[PDB]
């Protein structure tokens, strides 16, 4: 296990780390979210950049990042543009996506970025090396908002993210059945049994999938998303409820 340390937080041992997603259409609403969010307890702040309207301006995006870092100087910060094809709020060109992600890395404002595996091998491997050259960690991610791939497919996808240099492979899948939820947990456990080189984030989305967000210490998901007031993805529960369950499981 190559654990990831960001500001005294160790991702990939002990209790799963709680992530909450900040969503703001503009700099003023990003600022008000950050002030409200630093009154909640969690391990990692994700800025969902795709919710930001003025995405065309690299500098406006960096101004918004700065307002979040100013509000919370010592939170581990994850810069995440979620593309619409993986369930995000808007479309941008690959080129603009890598520009924003490189801008974020160079800013020194963020500790981690999200790179979607399906961006394409050469673009991901180059952005990963770029992140790593500036000591920014990569959460390499895949989302399927429609169905749950087989356990084999999710294990090979997560190992693929490892091979392209992901610090923290991440997969989030929509169950169609309770069976699909088990499949995801099986996939998670298979990485813990057989492929435990990098911590991995797994989740089965929606109401049926919620157990996947609670059980990460047993089956080996290194982090889980709670909601401060709005959920960034369906099946997230209130961040205090999530912390309660995590602590009862760790201390059992
Ligand atoms: C990845 C996963 C999400 C989830 O299913 O909880 C939320 C999204 O903001 C993250 O980027
Ligand atoms: Na994704
Ligand atoms: Na999808």
Numbering used by the authors: 1 to 252
From the paper:
Herein we report the synthesis of compounds 6–7 in which enhancement of the electrophilicity of an endocyclic carbon atom in the ligand towards covalent modification is attempted by direct introduction of the amino functionality into the quinate scaffold. These compounds are substrate analogs in which the carbonyl group at C3 has been replaced by a hydroxyamino and an amino group with R configuration (compounds 6 and 7, respectively). Compound 6 was found to be a time-dependent irreversible inhibitor of the two enzymes with K I values of 90 ± 8 and 130 ± 12 µM and k inact values of 8 ± 1 and 13 ± 1 ms−1 against Sa-DHQ1 and St-DHQ1, respectively. Unbiased, calculated electron-density maps showed clear electron density for the ligand covalently bonded to the catalytic lysine residue (K160/K170 in Sa-DHQ1 and St-DHQ1, respectively) via an amine, which is visible in the two chains. Surprisingly, no electron density for the tertiary hydroxyl group in position C1 was identified in the two enzyme adducts. Dehydration involving the C1–C2 bond took place to give a shikimate-like core, perhaps after covalent linkage at the C3 position in 6 via a similar mechanism to that observed for the natural substrate. For the St-DHQ1/6 enzyme adduct, a long hydrogen bond between the C5 hydroxyl group and the side chain of residue S21, which is located on the flexible substrate-covering loop, is also identified. The MALDI spectra of St-DHQ1 enzyme incubated with 6 in ∼1:120 enzyme/ligand ratio for 24 h and at 25°C showed a peak for a covalently modified enzyme corresponding to an additional mass of 158 (theoretical value of the increased mass = 156).
Several studies have identified the enzyme type I dehydroquinase (DHQ1, 3-dehydroquinate dehydratase, EC 4.2.1.10) as a promising target for anti-virulence drug development. DHQ1 catalyzes the reversible dehydratation of 3-dehydroquinic acid (1) to 3-dehydroshikimic acid (2), which is the third step in the shikimic acid pathway. It follows a covalent catalysis mechanism with the formation of transient Schiff base species´ between the ketone moiety of the substrate and the ɛ-amino group of a catalytic lysine residue (K160/K170 in Sa-DHQ1 and St-DHQ1, respectively), which are finally hydrolyzed to regenerate the enzyme.
